[PDB]
């Protein structure tokens, strides 16, 4: 075997006498300190490593190793699984040093901000948004004092990041005032004869308003963000703006326009960052979102699992980013295997997401509600596909508890007249249909349809799903056939208008319509709908021949200017 490097041998020999050289490792060159601490992690000395990474003196010299940063993202995660609250301790140490340094000159305070920017960016990359927000709040407090142009530029650069850490933590009410403050600093900086590139801020506001289910405002602000993309922007900012604009276009029924945006975002992420980077994982996750919302589910699982494997290898175990990848892949495997009933893998991913989130986030957090709702959806179909009625009454009761928790969280945060609570009402209607509570299921589905028609137009994907649910409740169970006829027709119209004739839910809609017309006496229509369903199945079998979504982007498809200009000229 090849001999071990003298660098690695000396690292092994300096770790071993760790107490005799603990204070001397901190005086090593900054690229040897991280290697020594990575040897501490590799040796299993997590207890000795936690006492070193909890000091901002030591962690600052570790954050400046950028090649081996993906290694640190694992080590810093392991300590947070080890029980060492490294993120909160580092945020508290930074806040303390900011309090001690606020009464000093602007030259030294700027260096404390730059240490703050990299630390806060690391904590927001790692997913500790509750602890990255403290660091960015301290940086904003440092920038607030002096009113010169440099301090205003640093303050807007920390408010385009404070908005990001208040969106991953689901604090949109604080996010609105953060964007207001960033806009105030931008206006003040513009009044002093200088312009700041407001692409990252508008992209973060697009993410906030899409997460708040304000798809019209989200689309407007993503258009305004894409107007501000230049050539000199960092690749991270361009990727984030492309990704959020793609999500806004998808939820605004612009699948032909979001395709190029998200494919170019994925290309940029795989080109600059690489195939094993958390930003590439984020782009893959939202690419899977786009593919899942364009009835391309058969490969969406192939994209979330690619996104999860990147996040689970870089971010270790109990991380919110791994939890988000799990709760997203659990919902795709729920959809991809809805016609197969093999939800064992989908349930495995769904209970893994809640197992992570309940450990690291409080019980009163929105991001727990989405994980609970996916597991509740999977438990619905497992209950209706088993045989024991005790299981059918236990799984459905657990799903009821999960949906009530999700509904109360979304109602407390978003409100009553939003879209997330509307689809929670739709899911409650589905669950009550499964629980033979047909009157309350009808009430829930009527509420969901009312809220979604009030907001999401009249021919949208979500209102189509809710209409299909209510119509299946009327037809298959409540036997109100004349009411279900118009709802089937509207669902067919929306599905054909949006996704064409290849929509997956068209199968369930056609089957319900066939039974509807069979139980009323329109038998020739029943036969014509059998042959329509056969044509649909043949068309879906033909459409099954689609290559993997990671090969559609190919190598160098377009560039940023072409895609941005195409989106801009396309309204």
């Amino acid at each position: 075997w090849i001999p071990e490097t003298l660098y690695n041998t000396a690292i092994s020999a300096v770790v071993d006498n760790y107490i005799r050289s603990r204070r001397d490792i901190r005086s090593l060159p900054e690229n040897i300190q991280f290697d020594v601490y990575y040897k501490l992690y590799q040796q299993g000395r997590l207890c000795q490593l936690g006492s070193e990474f909890c000091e901002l003196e030591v962690f600052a010299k570790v954050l400046r190793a950028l090649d081996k940063r993906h290694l640190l993202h694992h080590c810093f995660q392991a300590l947070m699984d080890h029980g060492v609250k490294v993120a909160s301790v580092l945020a508290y140490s930074f806040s303390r040093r900011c309090s001690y340094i606020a009464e000093s000159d602007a030259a030294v305070k700027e260096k404390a901000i730059q240490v703050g920017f990299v630390l806060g960016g690391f904590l927001s990359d790692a997913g500790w948004y509750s602890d990255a927000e403290k660091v960015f709040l301290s940086c904003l407090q440092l920038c607030t004092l002096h009113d010169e142009m440099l301090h205003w530029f640093r303050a807007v650069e920390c408010c385009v990041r404070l908005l990001h850490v208040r969106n991953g933590n689901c604090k949109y009410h604080l996010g609105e005032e953060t964007f207001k403050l960033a806009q105030t600093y931008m206006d003040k900086l513009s009044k002093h004869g200088q312009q700041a590139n407001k692409a990252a801020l508008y992209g973060e506001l697009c993410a906030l308003l899409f997460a708040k289910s304000h798809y019209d405002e989200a689309y407007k602000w993503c258009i305004e963000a894409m107007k501000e993309i230049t050539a000199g922007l960092p690749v991270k900012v361009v990727v984030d703006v492309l990704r959020q604009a793609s999500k806004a276009c998808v939820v605004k029924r612009e699948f032909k326009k979001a395709e190029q945006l998200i494919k170019h975002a994925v290309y940029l992420a795989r080109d600059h960052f690489g195939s094993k980077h958390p930003k590439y994982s984020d782009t893959l996750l939202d690419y899977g979102f786009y593919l899942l919302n364009v009835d391309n589910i058969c490969q969406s699982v192939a994209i979330y699992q690619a996104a999860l494997d990147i996040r689970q290898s870089v971010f270790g175990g109990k991380n919110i980013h791994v939890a988000t990848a799990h709760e997203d892949l659990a919902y795709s495997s729920y959809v991809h295997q809805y016609s197969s009933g093999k939800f064992d893998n989908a349930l495995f991913h769904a209970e893994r997401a809640i197992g992570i989130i309940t450990h690291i986030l409080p019980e009163d957090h929105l991001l727990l509600a989405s994980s609970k709702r996916v597991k509740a959806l999977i438990l619905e179909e497992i209950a209706i596909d088993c045989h024991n009625k005790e299981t059918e009454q236990r799984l459905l009761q657990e799903a009821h508890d999960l949906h009530l928790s999700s509904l109360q969280l979304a109602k407390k945060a978003f409100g009553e007249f939003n879209v997330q609570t509307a689809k929670h009402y739709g899911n409650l209607g589905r669950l009550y249909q499964s629980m033979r509570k047909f009157k309350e299921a009808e009430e829930m589905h009527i509420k969901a349809i009312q809220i979604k028609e009030q907001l999401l137009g009249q021919e949208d994907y979500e209102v189509a799903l809710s209409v299909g649910h209510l119509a299946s409740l009327y037809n298959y169970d409540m036997n109100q056939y004349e009411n279900a006829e118009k709802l089937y027709l509207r669902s067919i119209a929306i599905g054909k208008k949006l996704f064409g004739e290849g929509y997956s839910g068209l199968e369930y809609d056609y089957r319900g319509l066939i039974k509807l017309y069979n139980s009323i006496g329109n038998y020739e229509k029943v036969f014509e709908y059998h042959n329509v369903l056969s044509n649909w199945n043949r068309l879906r079998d033909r459409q099954y021949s689609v290559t993997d979504a990671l090969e559609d982007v190919s190598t160098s498809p377009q560039s940023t200017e072409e895609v941005v200009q195409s989106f801009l000229i396309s309204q």
Partner: peptide, 9 residues
């Protein structure tokens, strides 16, 4: 399979 799928995550 009397129903459709669930809305969003």
């Amino acid at each position: 399979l009397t129903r459709n799928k669930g809305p969003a995550a």
